[PDB]
Amino acid sequence: PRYQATLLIELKKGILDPQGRAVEGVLKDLGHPVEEVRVGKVLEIVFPAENLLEAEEKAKAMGALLANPVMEVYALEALKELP
């Protein structure tokens, strides 16, 4: 079946997040103060697979490929079969 993996590639703890800092700063100047903003990338990937288990496997593999070992971590936020 066709599946869609929602992969998040985010910065590990400690990694400087200029974009995030910037966003926090702005949100506050806009009357929406927040404690923290972490900016990452989200990738919606559609691909075929034998079953849901193999899909997760493949999804994870692509996440591991897209994530910078030192700077980031990936996360399979969601995985679902498509019509």
From TrEMBL:
Gene3D superfamilies: Phosphoribosylformylglycinamidine synthase subunit PurS. Its EC number is 6.3.5.3. Keywords: ATP-binding, Cytoplasm, Ligase, Nucleotide-binding, Purine biosynthesis. It is an enzyme of class 6 (ligase). The keyword Protein biosynthesis does not apply. One of its GO terms (biological process) is 'de novo' IMP biosynthetic process. Part of the phosphoribosylformylglycinamidine synthase complex involved in the purines biosynthetic pathway. Catalyzes the ATP-dependent conversion of formylglycinamide ribonucleotide (FGAR) and glutamine to yield formylglycinamidine ribonucleotide (FGAM) and glutamate. The FGAM synthase complex is composed of three subunits. PurQ produces an ammonia molecule by converting glutamine to glutamate. PurL transfers the ammonia molecule to FGAR to form FGAM in an ATP-dependent manner. NCBIfam families: phosphoribosylformylglycinamidine synthase subunit PurS (TIGR00302). This is Phosphoribosylformylglycinamidine synthase subunit PurS. It comes from Thermus thermophilus (strain ATCC 27634 / DSM 579 / HB8).
